[PDB]
């Protein structure tokens, strides 16, 4: 009970039935709901059976398309779970069909419904993790390029650097913004927003520092030490914030084989 919904999307999908089931689990250990005859679900159940097959199909396709190795190994197991719990639901239906007061058939409905719900969540979680894993890479990439900042000594380089980092800094910003907007734990969202913003505010600051540097370089006018410090400090603080973001992201999207 009370799942770990990470994004609003998933929750808006699982929350409904997750409740219809939780409100029912309470109707067993302390109530044992049993009496009302259940009309043949040969139809309604069919509705789920069909959607389950469709789901499984898409997942099998998602595996072929995907490149993430964890997904190719985590999803397949989920397919079965949703398919297995579904055969149970379908059976529990024909059971009630012949006998609407069958108690055992009532059990098949619950166990099968929770199985389908759990099998689904696992599928969505896996997928989400892969998505997040895509962001971490992008983040790890920006981190790396910030390292090259200390190699730029000419305006020609500075121009190059800016044209490469800028686009990157945008993709990450886009991914981060589109991420926090889905997060459900207001706690993690604050860290992401503040971090990303701080990083966006430092970029222009980084460039300027580098510019001032390359300017002092080819110029009789001494005073270049303090320039390297500001540039270096920016990278350091920027890097800190990015490492912060990565971490917050890995809190739930991490697996033993994260390669």
């Amino acid at each position: 009970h009370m799942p770990v919904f990470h994004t609003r999307t998933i929750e808006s999908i699982l929350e409904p039935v997750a409740q219809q089931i939780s409100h029912l689990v309470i109707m067993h250990e302390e109530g044992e709901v049993d009496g009302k005859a259940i009309p043949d679900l040969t139809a309604p159940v069919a509705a789920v059976q069909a959607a389950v097959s469709n789901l499984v199909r898409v997942g099998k396709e998602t595996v072929q398309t995907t490149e993430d190795q964890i997904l190719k190994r985590d999803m397949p197991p989920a397919f079965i779970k949703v398919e297995n719990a579904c055969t149970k639901l379908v059976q529990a239906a024909q059971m009630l069909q012949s006998d609407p007061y069958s108690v055992p058939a009532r059990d098949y409905l619950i166990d099968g419904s929770r199985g389908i719900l759990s099998g689904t969540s696992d599928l969505l979680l896996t997928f989400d993790e892969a998505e997040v894993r895509k962001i971490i890479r992008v983040c790890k990439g920006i981190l790396e390029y910030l390292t090259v900042a200390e190699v730029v000594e000419t305006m020609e380089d500075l121009v190059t650097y800016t044209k490469n980092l800028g686009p990157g800094m945008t993709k990450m910003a886009k991914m981060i913004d589109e991420r926090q907007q889905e997060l459900t734990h207001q706690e993690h969202r604050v860290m992401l927003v503040n971090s990303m913003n701080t990083v966006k505010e430092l970029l222009p600051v980084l460039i300027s520092a580098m510019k001032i540097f390359v300017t002092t370089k080819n110029s009789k006018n001494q005073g270049i030490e303090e320039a390297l410090k500001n540039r270096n400090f920016t990278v350091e603080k920027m890097s800190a914030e990015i490492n912060e973001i990565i971490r917050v992201l890995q809190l739930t999207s991490w697996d033993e084989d994260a390669w």
């Binding site: 999307t9 409904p16 219809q20 029912l24 259940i38 679900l41 639901l89 969505l124």
Partner: peptide, 22 residues
């Protein structure tokens, strides 16, 4: 994307199934 679409279908059709128990 298309994964979230199918997922809802599952939960939707399964909602109208459990609803007939309350």
């Amino acid at each position: 994307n298309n994964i979230y679409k199918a997922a809802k279908d599952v939960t939707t059709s399964l909602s109208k199934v459990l609803k007939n128990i309350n």
